[PDB]
């Protein structure tokens, strides 16, 4: 049954090439560049005493949650820098953290195979472990909320799972990835999500039934970052090959590649502005860069972090961008 | 400027900051140890003697609180989560001597040691190597010579010489000899003395870190 795999892959590539009548590079040539997008560090969130690997912005564009190796989640009031909540973690090894769209729940996890959900609206005040999503056989890489009751998870098992917090058990398991899944991205409509894995491939999945809609390839190394375009018809990915690639779901292939000779290191996080014109991705060597989603030019540099920019997030309204880093500090730009 | 509730929110943030600082100060004195080895290297036995995913074992010895990370259950890609342990004071390595002729786990253990010790994240991290289950090595070697797996071995197939050669080959894999040190030891099923050796290694690592801070190392 594997003899026809190469033939089908060749047919898919031929169809993609036939439908590739033009490229975004020649289509956006006449569009004026966004210019130098200068951003200042409006806020400097301090209080973390260990390497920070994940963060998530709130739907209100004010509250954000960050995770560090100190085994605790800190809810930051970005407008005033106040720490809304401090949530000790039973496991000090946390690699991902998510903030519920309604804000009533916060989830995180990591080397522990549980994407523990924390209830911020607890009656007793102190934040408790509402549920533990056990069942994964590998380190958790990312679990993003869908609603108060549904949440997706990605881990090192090479598979993603959909969980119901009330039930506490998997309801839809996503399989097909050969490499470890490192990131997740939820579409604006919440109907589809794309997960990047270490096999240099990004796959589109359906939450309702778990079927893989599409498979994306082109990266030369492991994929560590993924984020949807605001319209939901495209998404960008960041891999260890130091080049960010933009994929359109309908086109089912790469559209633009963002890379520079100066950058010779992998990508850690990727995000899009509200309009999606500006592509912001975290990079090694302790600085971040902004790429024009259309012109692919380096719009600007978000420098100031003393360590790797592990995570990057943009407010739903696009008012500000908060970048986490291993120096235990989050800076809002 | 700030209202009554805003002042209360700032006070709550200050209390959270104080709690965070206290927790960080407590954790700074805590000793972080990483446990690695083959599937049957005996790391589980070691942690049991001292005391699905990562397992944290906490124990205390001579005023030092030690927390060990058993990452043997992590079957995922190593480089995607090994970097999290960059801050570990020392890395404990478990190797089963008896598995020299058991099918070639010694080869896998040596590859693991080469990958971990030479990793960019552990350039300055010392490795506390442990040779587990020599009570089986001393007997099996009598019947099965060590030359079966490694023709390069020379001399009589005695437990002492074989152990010395295996140790020397282990520290031969170290490409950062001038930057890190390997503290090899044999478990011998001696809980008290094994924990004493671990404590001595931790103390030596802390002393070298202090000397580095002083510029002497």
């Amino acid at each position: 049954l594997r003899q026809e795999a190469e033939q089908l892959k060749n047919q898919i590539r031929d169809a993609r090439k036939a439908c590739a009548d033009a490229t975004l590079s020649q289509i956006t040539n006449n569009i004026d560049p966004v210019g130098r997008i200068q951003m200042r560090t409006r806020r400097t969130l301090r209080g973390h005493l260990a390497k920070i690997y994940a963060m998530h912005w709130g739907t209100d564009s004010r509250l954000l949650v960050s995770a560090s190796q100190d085994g605790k989640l800190i809810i930051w009031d970005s407008y005033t820098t106040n720490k809304v909540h401090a949530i000790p973690l039973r496991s000090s090894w946390v690699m991902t953290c998510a903030y519920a769209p309604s804000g009533n729940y916060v989830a995180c996890g990591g080397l522990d195979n549980i994407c523990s959900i924390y209830n911020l609206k607890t009656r007793e005040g102190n934040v408790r472990v509402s549920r533990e999503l056990a069942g994964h056989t590998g380190y958790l890489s990312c679990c993003r909320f869908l609603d108060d009751n549904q949440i997706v998870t990605s881990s090192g098992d090479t598979t993603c799972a959909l969980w119901d917090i009330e039930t506490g058990q998997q309801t839809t398991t996503f399989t097909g990835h050969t490499g470890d899944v490192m990131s997740l991205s939820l579409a604006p409509d919440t109907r589809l999500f794309v997960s990047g894995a270490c096999d240099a491939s990004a796959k589109l999945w359906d939450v309702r039934e778990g079927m893989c809609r599409q498979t994306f390839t082109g990266h030369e190394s492991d994929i560590n970052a993924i984020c949807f375009f605001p319209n939901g018809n495209a998404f960008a990915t960041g891999s260890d090959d130091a080049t960010c690639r933009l994929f359109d779901l309908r086109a089912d292939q790469e559209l633009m590649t963002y890379s520079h000779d100066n950058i010779i290191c992998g990508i850690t996080s990727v995000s899009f502005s509200k309009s999606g014109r500006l592509l912001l991705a975290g990079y090694d060597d302790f600085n971040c860069n902004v790429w024009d989603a259309l012109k692919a030019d380096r719009a600007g540099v978000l420098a100031g972090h003393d360590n790797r920019v592990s995570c990057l997030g943009v407010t739903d309204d696009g008012m500000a961008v908060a970048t986490g880093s291993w120096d235990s500090f989050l800076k809002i730009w | 400027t700030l209202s009554a509730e805003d002042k209360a929110a700032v006070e709550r943030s200050k209390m959270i900051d104080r709690n965070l600082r206290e927790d960080g100060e407590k954790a700074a004195r805590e000793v972080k140890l990483l446990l690695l080895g083959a599937g049957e290297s005996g790391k589980n036995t070691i942690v049991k003697q001292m005391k699905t995913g990562i397992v944290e074992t906490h124990f205390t010895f001579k005023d030092l609180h030690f927390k060990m990370f058993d990452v043997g259950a992590q079957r995922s890609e190593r480089k995607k989560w090994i970097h999290c342990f960059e801050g570990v004071t020392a890395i404990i390595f478990c190797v089963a001597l008896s598995d020299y002729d058991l099918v070639n786990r010694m080869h896998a253990s040596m590859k693991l040691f080469d990958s971990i010790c030479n990793n960019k994240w552990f350039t300055d991290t010392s490795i506390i190597l442990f040779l587990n289950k020599k009570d089986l090595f001393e007997e099996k070697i009598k019947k099965s010579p060590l030359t079966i797996c490694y023709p390069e071995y020379a001399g009589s197939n005695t437990y002492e010489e074989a152990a010395a050669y295996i140790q020397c080959q282990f520290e031969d894999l170290n490409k950062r000899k001038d930057t890190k040190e390997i503290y090899t030891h044999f478990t011998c099923s001696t809980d008290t003395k094994n924990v004493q050796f671990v404590f001595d290694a931790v103390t030596d690592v802390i002393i070298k870190n202090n000397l580095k801070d002083c510029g002497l190392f």
Partner: single-chain antibody
Amino acid sequence: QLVESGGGLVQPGGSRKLSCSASGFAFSSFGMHWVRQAPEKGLEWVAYISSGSGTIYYADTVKGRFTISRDDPKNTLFLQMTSLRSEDTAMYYCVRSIYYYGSSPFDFWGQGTTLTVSSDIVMTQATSSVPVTPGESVSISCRSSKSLLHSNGNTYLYWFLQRPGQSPQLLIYRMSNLASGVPDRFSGSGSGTAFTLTISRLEAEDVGVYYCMQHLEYPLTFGAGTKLE
């Protein structure tokens, strides 16, 4: 759950100890307020102690006369009272509050205990009485002498409903957010200085006294109280 103890008849100028045992919640992380209600008059703020006793405030009528302390290990709130005056007779309510973005201060009020002795913003509720019947819509108007719309955009106003023979319960906080467990019937809106409470499809349990409270700066003040029957 909050229970108050240390009441009873006292002579004028005497001293008594009030104990407010706290259970069912993290008393350490919750700020505590003391509110005293006379047998017929409205609520009156007494004192406030923040979490960890880092900040303590008292009303002008009791400043320098009443002291408030906390003991987290015992989960009990203490209020040492000395030089009790004749007017001090009132039912003291132990109020729970936590202050952070999106929080609901004064959400939970204790049952309270009755004690008998042998510049600030003032809320106006001239509409003392407004008869209502089930299924009818009624509006309660509250006015303040100072604009409660802070520079940050938060209008620090609170609505409390007290049923006959029951302690007050938080109804609306910040003039726009309904406290947990409050039916969606109640609504809150108003201008910088003009405030009003809207009740839709009023039903039997809505009967009670509604109090308008301001939290822009201490000391806290409560309205006269609108009685619905």
